[PDB]
Design an enzyme around this catalytic site. Structure first.
Site, PDB file in Angstrom:
ATOM      1  CE  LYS A 143      -2.408   1.082   3.706  1.00 19.67           C
ATOM      2  NZ  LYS A 143      -2.129   2.511   3.989  1.00 19.67           N
TER       3      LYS A 143
ATOM      4  CD  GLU B 157       0.513   5.836   9.752  1.00 25.83           C
ATOM      5  OE1 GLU B 157      -0.604   5.968   9.214  1.00 25.83           O
ATOM      6  OE2 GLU B 157       1.211   4.813   9.596  1.00 25.83           O
ATOM      7  NE  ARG B 158      -0.951  -0.064  13.566  1.00 20.85           N
ATOM      8  CZ  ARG B 158      -1.550  -0.435  12.446  1.00 20.85           C
ATOM      9  NH1 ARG B 158      -1.043  -0.070  11.281  1.00 20.85           N
ATOM     10  NH2 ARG B 158      -2.639  -1.185  12.491  1.00 20.85           N
TER      11      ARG B 158
END
Ligand SMILES: Nc1ncnc2c1ncn2[C@@H]1O[C@H](COP(=O)(O)OP(=O)(O)OP(=O)(O)O)[C@@H](O)[C@H]1O
Lengths: 50, 56, 506, 89, 473
Positions: free
Chosen positions: E158, E184-185
């Site tokens: 991705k 977001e991580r």
């Protein structure tokens, strides 16, 4: 006809930024002082009328 | 008054039953169907072919 | 050039003239703005649902009154209305400009046009909260609304004053039915008789800006904008606008209703109006009901859709006909919202997703889509040559799951199966090609009486345009007969059978 | 109302040297006459097609003809192939 | 100069109550500062309780606030530096860079709660954005200034897909990228930054082609409910000022819906149905309707979707799907056949796969492709059951053609030049339509299947056909 309407829209947005220029022209004046007299006589006109 | 032409064409269709294997005769009626169906939408599709000098 | 500055200076005279009489028996400070609603102290002579104007241009409706303070809901983002500002009251119950001058324009919920074509030539103001007409000035419906689709006027006909529901799922072809109906009304909007014209008011709620932009572009390609009224309440704008905009559009519809003319309105889509209403009732602590639509959400769609029926001769024989659109969730007809629109409207056109997945567009499920007072107001011709068609599609639906076994059967089920497949492939229709009733009669007539049975299944899509051009080139007088009379006599029927069997023979 | 009056007088007169007298523009640093009536005047024929669509091309149609006046060496072939069809008929 | 100084009266978790002295109050959605020893602590006024007292949501950690600290006002909304200097600089929702590359010398500072564009300026015919990847521009074309739902979990390429979009928009339309990780991580935030350095889309010395906005997970929920707006404003300045077509990447919009849920549940508003906030439609619209096409330029958005519990009647995907113009699925069963990218053909459907917009030829080619792969999928069971003897000449050619198409969908990447070494082929649309059209006709059936894997266009198809003809003899 489409281009005429587009040119009218361009004339109106030019006079819109000219209105911004007129705001800049108005706000430096002692109409800030002189216009308090206008409100004074206007309140005389309104509140006496009833 | 085109219905007399087309009526006699379907009369020849039920008479061209008698000759099976028609090469291009029905295809000739297909070509008259092509441009006759084209001309009616062509005449109904158009405006009065002029610039409207009064309003427009 | 300076001509709009001339007009705006005349409006400055109005503003300066209004300033000479501006004494606002009303003004009060904004105590607190929170949850997207404002509490106002003062205004000791305000009305229930009176329009007010804050000091930043955001208007508001005062929907509740308490001893001490008044609660005013907003009409936009609350970014503009600041604490401690000044609240003049306008003086009006919430009204919108109605009249014929809105034709062509694109307004939002308060009559402010956003097309960029100058101010609204407004023939008057009218309330948003109008009481519906009572049971006495009503007549049961008796005039057709020719939608131009094949399957709609075949199976589920629409009367002037018959509230019909277009229910369906997401991206399953819901809007296209209403759009094709608006484009079909070009048959009479170009004409001259008023009582056959049919004005279209399309009321987009909760949709994107660019979708309404493309829809205005579509209604100006095919020239519908000499009779269209777009009321847009796009999802960028805040919730009480969406709560209001279909009601103001119903006032627009009632203006055409009381004045003798006939008018169609399309709500699209009220499952986002109930979203906006559950937002406005879950920010005022009113406790939710089933599936968190608040307990009066039946009453909302009630008081909306009940301002649309057929007035009798006593009031001027005008009308208003509504097509609300309901977005369900995955083919459901039993959530709490679509079991309230169904319990108001006079029937459903259930656009099932599975049939559009097989490309059959529009995807009317025939065995579910029904109408209650449609049958008394269909065109007489279709009612003569499709009195079998509903029962025949019911017959074909009976043997739908019986033929999936693959078992060899008798002759009658094979005959009905072939004719049913020809009718299912027959009712397809491309976008933006509504067929008038004068051409809907012969195609259905070729479908009913077994004439299609020799044709292969793939040729039917071009059989439609071929048989139509065959009738347009040669038997034009039959189309004029169906146009004028609207009814098939015996001689008309025999001539039509000859004209079928001619083109059927090749 | 001298509020309204002085506002409308500056409103009228401050672009009146852009509309009434063509002393083109004092505040705008680019010139105004080579924007709309010089560049954008050919705008719609800079936005649409030039010298075919706007000049509109009053054009003569291609005079399509008949079967070029040759009966014989193809009517005999049509006659014999029609004999062959009626063999197959 | 004339500050609006008040006192913090109450700290409740991420909610902060600020008292102001009289006749001074800023309206809703205005930025407020608190100076800390650690830096600055930003608040956004969301509710006015009256009493000259406002109530805000946090934008950073609210430990250690003595009630009674001075509250400085900045009048406008949350300011963000915009423009050319922002490229390659990891800006948080405050407006300060966190890459430690010094302060950003940007020219303007823009508000983020702006108006969406008015109805007269919405572009009235959505054309097709030529992205550059073949299967995108063939099957599910991205709407120019439209919305695109990119599904699928991580590890299926991705990030490779999204860097490929970055390079191809940099080449073909010349547009810049604004990436935005809402929620977001953090670890994969750094891994994305390192990979975007090494792929060349971030040049720390030259001209990078992207602006990163990483709203991390450990910020309070008022941050994540505005990080997408920060990325949106950085998109809007590139749209309406310099006049481009800008790609706004948002991952992951469901975490934005969570941010909305927790902000409007911390404020004490009553929660809706399933438990998302009752301002769901409006606070999705204020993110969606600012991503559109005006007459100046356009911003096209690629935004992911985490489908909750694999269910599509849950209102957060059921609200995002009332806005998405085109979906794009990166499935498992396509990268499992070693296909780059893994754009699954049967699932990624567009609302702009229509002949009235893309033209008749494009729609015909795409419809035959979808029916070809549909018949291929419906045959794939009896291919294993019965073998290629039950195929007639109506059918065995379709199996061969569909294998040719399925191999032909893969594309050499502009970013997999350090992965696979094959240099990327930016394929135009007018090559793509003609290439798929010629394969659908049957003019290259003699060409073997192996020469269709990782090929740019029909010309490199012919070249690889000749090269594998030479290597076989
Ligand atoms: N007769 C038709 N011909 C071609 N396309 C059609 C037809 N009917 C429906 N469609 C397709 O259906 C798609 C969606 O149409 P429509 O807007 O009616 O669906 P919808 O569910 O109403 O979407 P929304 O609810 O978002 O408005 C369009 O892309 C259109 O191409």
């Amino acid at each position: 006809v489409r281009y005429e309407a587009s040119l009218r829209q361009l004339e109106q947005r030019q006079l819109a930024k000219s209105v911004i220029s007129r705001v800049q022209s108005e706000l430096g004046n002692p109409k800030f002082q002189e216009k308090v007299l206008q409100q004074s006589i206007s309140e005389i006109e309104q509140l006496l009328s009833k | 008054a085109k219905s007399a032409a087309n009526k006699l064409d379907w009369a020849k269709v039920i008479s061209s039953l008698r000759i099976t294997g028609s090469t291009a005769t029905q295809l000739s009626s297909f070509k008259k169907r092509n441009d006759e169906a084209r001309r009616q939408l062509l005449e109904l599709q158009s405006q009065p072919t002029e610039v409207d000098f009064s309003h427009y | 050039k300076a001509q709009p500055t001339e007009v705006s200076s005349i409006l400055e005279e109005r503003i300066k003239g209004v300033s000479d009489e501006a004494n606002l028996n009303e003004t009060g400070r904004v105590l607190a703005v929170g949850d997207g609603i404002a509490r106002v102290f003062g205004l000791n002579n305000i009305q229930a649902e009176e329009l007010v104007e804050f000091s930043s241009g955001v208007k508001g409706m005062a929907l509740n009154l308490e001893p001490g303070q008044v609660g005013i809901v907003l009409f936009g983002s609350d970014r503009l209305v600041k604490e401690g500002e000044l609240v003049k009251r306008t003086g009006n119950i919430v009204d919108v400009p109605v009249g014929p001058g809105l034709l062509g324009r694109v307004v939002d919920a308060l009559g402010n046009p956003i097309d960029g074509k100058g101010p609204i030539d407004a023939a008057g103001r009218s309330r948003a909260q109008v009481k519906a007409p009572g049971i006495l000035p009503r007549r049961s419906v008796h005039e057709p609304v020719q939608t131009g689709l094949k399957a709609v006027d075949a199976l589920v006909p629409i009367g002037r004053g018959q509230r019909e529901l277009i229910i369906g799922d997401r991206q399953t072809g819901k809007t296209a039915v209403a759009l094709d109906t608006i484009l079909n009304q070009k048959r009479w909007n170009n004409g001259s008789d008023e009582s056959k014209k049919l004005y279209c008011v399309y009321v987009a709620v909760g949709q994107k800006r660019s979708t309404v932009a493309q829809l205005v572009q579509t209604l100006e390609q095919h020239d519908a904008m000499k009779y269209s009224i777009i009321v847009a309440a796009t999802a960028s704008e805040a919730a009480p606008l969406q709560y209001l905009a279909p009601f103001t559009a119903a006032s627009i519809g009632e203006w055409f209703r009381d004045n003798g003319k006939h008018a169609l309105i399309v709500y699209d889509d009220l499952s986002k109006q109930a979203v906006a209403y559950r937002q406005l009732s879950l920010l005022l602590r009113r406790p939710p009901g089933r599936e968190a639509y608040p307990g009066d959400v039946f009453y909302l769609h009630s008081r909306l859709l009940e301002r649309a029926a057929k007035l009798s001769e006593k009031e001027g024989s005008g009308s208003l006909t509504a097509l609300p659109v309901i977005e369900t969730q995955g083919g459901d007809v039993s959530a709490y919202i679509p079991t309230n629109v169904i319990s108001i409207t006079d029937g459903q056109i259930f656009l099932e997703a599975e049939l559009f997945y097989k490309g059959i567009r529009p995807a009317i499920n025939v065995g579910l889509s029904v109408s209650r007072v449609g049958s008394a107001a269909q065109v007489k011709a279709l009612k003569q040559v499709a009195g079998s068609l509903k029962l025949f599609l019911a017959q074909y639906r009976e043997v739908a799951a019986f033929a999936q076994f693959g078992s060899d059967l008798d002759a009658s089920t094979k005959q009905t199966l072939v004719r049913g497949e020809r009718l299912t492939q027959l009712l397809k229709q491309n976008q933006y090609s509504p067929l008038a009733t004068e051409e809907q009669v012969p195609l259905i007539y070729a479908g009913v009486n077994g004439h299609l049975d020799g044709i292969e299944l793939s040729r039917i899509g071009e059989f439609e345009s071929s048989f139509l051009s065959y009738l347009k080139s040669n038997h034009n007088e039959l189309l004029t007969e169906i146009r004028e009379k609207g009814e098939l006599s015996k001689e008309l029927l025999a001539s039509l059978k000859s004209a079928t069997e001619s083109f059927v023979a090749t | 109302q001298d509020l309204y009056l002085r506002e409308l007088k500056d409103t009228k007169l401050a672009p009146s040297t852009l509309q009434d007298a063509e002393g083109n523009v004092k505040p705008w640093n680019p010139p105004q006459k080579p924007n709309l009536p010089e560049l954008e005047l050919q705008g719609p024929e800079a936005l649409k097609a030039y010298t075919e669509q706007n000049v509109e091309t009053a054009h003569v149609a291609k005079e399509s003809e008949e079967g070029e006046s040759e009966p014989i060496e193809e009517d005999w072939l049509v006659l014999d192939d029609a004999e062959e069809t009626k063999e197959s008929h | 100069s004339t500050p609006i100084t008040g006192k913090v009266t109450a700290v409740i978790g991420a909610i902060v109550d600020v008292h102001f002295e009289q006749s001074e109050l800023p309206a809703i959605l205005n930025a407020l500062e608190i100076k800390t020893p650690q830096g600055k602590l930003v608040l956004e006024v969301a509710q006015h309780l009256g009493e000259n007292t406002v109530r805000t949501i946090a934008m950073d950690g609210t430990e250690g606030l003595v009630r009674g600290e001075k509250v400085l006002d900045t009048g406008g909304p949350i300011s963000v530096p915009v423009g050319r200097e922002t490229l390659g600089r990891i800006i948080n929702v405050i407006g300060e860079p966190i890459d430690e590359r010094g302060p950003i010398k940007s020219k303007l500072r823009k508000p983020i709660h702006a108006d969406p564009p008015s109805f007269a300026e919405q572009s009235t015919s959505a054309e097709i954005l030529e992205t550059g990847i073949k299967v995108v521009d063939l099957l599910a074309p991205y709407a120019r200034g439209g919305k695109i739902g990119l599904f699928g979990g991580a590890g299926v390429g991705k990030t490779v897909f999204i860097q490929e979009l970055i390079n191809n928009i940099a080449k073909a339309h010349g547009g810049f990228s604004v990436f935005t990780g809402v929620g977001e991580r953090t670890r994969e935030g750094n891994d994305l930054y390192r990979e975007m350095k090494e792929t060349g889309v971030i040049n720390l010395e030259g001209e990078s082609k992207v602006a990163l906005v990483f709203g991390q997970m450990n910020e309070p929920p008022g941050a994540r409910a505005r990080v997408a707006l920060t990325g949106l404003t950085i998109a809007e300045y590139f749209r309406d000022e310099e006049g481009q077509d800008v790609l706004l990447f948002i991952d992951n919009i469901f975490r934005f819906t969570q941010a909305g849920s927790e902000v409007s549940a911390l404020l004490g508003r009553i929660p809706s149905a399933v438990g998302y906030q009752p301002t769901l439609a409006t606070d999705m619209g204020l993110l969606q309707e600012r991503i559109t096409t005006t007459k100046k330029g356009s911003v096209t958005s690629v935004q992911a979707v985490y489908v909750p519990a694999d269910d599509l009647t849950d209102p957060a995907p059921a609200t995002t799907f009332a806005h998405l113009d085109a979906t794009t699925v990166l499935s498992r069963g396509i990268s499992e056949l070693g296909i780059y990218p893994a754009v699954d053909p049967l699932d990624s459907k567009s609302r702009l796969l229509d002949a009235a917009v893309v033209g008749q030829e494009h729609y015909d080619v795409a419809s035959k492709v979808q029916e070809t792969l549909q018949t291929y999928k419906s045959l794939q069971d009896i291919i294993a059951i019965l073998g290629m003897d039950e195929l007639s000449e109506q059918d065995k050619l379709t199996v061969e053609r569909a294998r040719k198409i399925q191999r032909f969908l893969s594309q050499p990447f502009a970013v997999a030049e350090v992965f696979t070494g094959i240099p990327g082929k930016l394929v135009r649309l007018k090559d793509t339509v003609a290439s798929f059209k010629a394969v659908l006709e049957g003019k290259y059936d003699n060409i073997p299947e192996h020469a269709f894997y990782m090929v740019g266009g029909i010309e490199d198809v012919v070249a690889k056909a000749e090269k594998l003809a030479a290597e076989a003899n």
